[PDB]
Amino acid sequence: PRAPRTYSKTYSTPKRPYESSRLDAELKLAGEFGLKNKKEIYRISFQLSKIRRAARDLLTRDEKDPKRLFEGNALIRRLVRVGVLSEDKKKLDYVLALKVEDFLERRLQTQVYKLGLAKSVHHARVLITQRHIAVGKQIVNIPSFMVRLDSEKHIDFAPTSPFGGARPGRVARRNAARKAEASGE
Amino acid sequence: VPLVNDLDPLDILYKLLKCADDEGIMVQEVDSKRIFNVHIKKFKSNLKIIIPDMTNFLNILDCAKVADFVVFGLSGVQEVDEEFGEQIIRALELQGIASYIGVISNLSAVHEKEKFQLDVKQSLESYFKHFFPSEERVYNLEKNSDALNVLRTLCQRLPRSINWRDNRGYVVADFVDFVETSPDSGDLVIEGTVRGIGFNANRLVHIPDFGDFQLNKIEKISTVFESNMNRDTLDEYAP
């Protein structure tokens, strides 16, 4: 034998499948941000609905209760460090009215279009996938990075991509090898 | 049956017998012999190993139809040829045949890196996708562990053979000698083992390139029978 390897499932579908007032607000997020399927939106409601449950009972036990103070001021501290809670909303009741696009506005697909690198929200997810953008020194290629707050200011192009750096791709090299040698013949 | 003209089936035999755990069976049987009778002292079975001559073609066409397992060799340096290799494959299956094993002798010729000797197997699967959807493996006899379950299956199985050749009786010869009965006609002693259903003294026997000849007696040597006078019309145009 050996030890077993833990895993977890990360989303959850909803109870009523075909009812129309749900189906549109999911649609207007998938066109606003450009997400592939609605499994990507269930992924952000799961993660939210365990944050909300975690604060939902530290509120029940008393104040000046040392489990509220150790597990509270860490949950608050992690949400600000990625930049979802506002810096003036550092109180535990304020996380109970958090919303689902306050995480959706921190992905790399959304934080690169706002910071002036791509002309549309679909020019982001194809710029990232093809290894062009590199926070720090690291080419990432995941459209759901959830950028930390003190590293919003490091995003740029890559020191290998033809856009922000060296040699052109194998169209322009192929076109230069289609015309410059063909200038004599 | 080799499927290209430059092959050493005696060496393919010596790639089939190195994994048999005797040693003194291959070296003494080399000079000019095409029939072999060998007893396998591991799975406790005896084999009748034959090998025809590629210079003739007609001998190839009946050495299949005596047997029940046909070892189909392939090549690791070429593909098959149409008029001679592919036609002789199309020959035997259309006249009817029992089961068979496709196999490759040598895979030294492709370069000693591993992945290049992998896919050349997949190329050699080509004549078992449109010919037969009933056999998916090709056993590499250079591998010792692939060369053993090619010995497991022929010593321990027997397939559905043909219909018509089975239900009449057929003997292969082992010792043929002529003895004298008359200057008009003598006698041939034939030593062998009867396959099929048997041979009885009320009908005739044909051998190709010699034709039809009349028996006289039957003796089983570890049942002495004779030919009665109930013969048929031993002629061409019966009156």
Partner: protein, 260 residues
Amino acid sequence: ARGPKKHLKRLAAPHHWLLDKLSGCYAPRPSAGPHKLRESLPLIVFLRNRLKYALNGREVKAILMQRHVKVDGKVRTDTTYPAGFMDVITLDATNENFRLVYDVKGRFAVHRITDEEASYKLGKVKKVQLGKKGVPYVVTHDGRTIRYPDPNIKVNDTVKIDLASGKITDFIKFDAGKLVYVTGGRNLGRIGTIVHKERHDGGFDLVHIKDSLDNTFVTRLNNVFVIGEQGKPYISLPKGKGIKLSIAEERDRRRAQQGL
């Protein structure tokens, strides 16, 4: 089964050794020796999971066969010899001397000591009896027997042992207000002093111990190891010195110390 068992599986290994749960399938099983099974630490968990000197099992046997590693002034080559509490591990080709003693969160700590503290060893007193031909002896917690003691020694006291000749210098009694180490249970590794000790006839006796910051707790009698009189131990204590810090107090004490 039919005889003794001889393998230890990986998840059943004792937790405070901190073997990672994916590298293999079995753990080292400690040999039969001076200290108990789940209260000790073999010489392979020391020399490759603490000091990081060796990278294999095959490297540890290459160290032990060169006759470097001693315990208590005696050479060992058993690759799972069971070193336990208060043992002295004297390497030679580095001139380092170690002493096995407890951490605060419940672990066996790396501790370097001098070249003069490594000449002796404490040990408590598990029983005192009258042997054959009328001589008495005394049994320590690691199993040393020593004949001819002073008569004033009783059980649960503490002796001091000289590792050279295997003999006694002096001893400490057991009463109220002494320095005490705690070697088993939940408050494991804390140091404090005796308030008083109540007794239950035919049961397990309880001591009450006060810290230095004056907060108290209770354990059974046998998890209590006397060290010295108040304010004066006989051994070199680790950092923290057996003070329990609450988890609130040790986040920010790590925060303000984070100035590197």
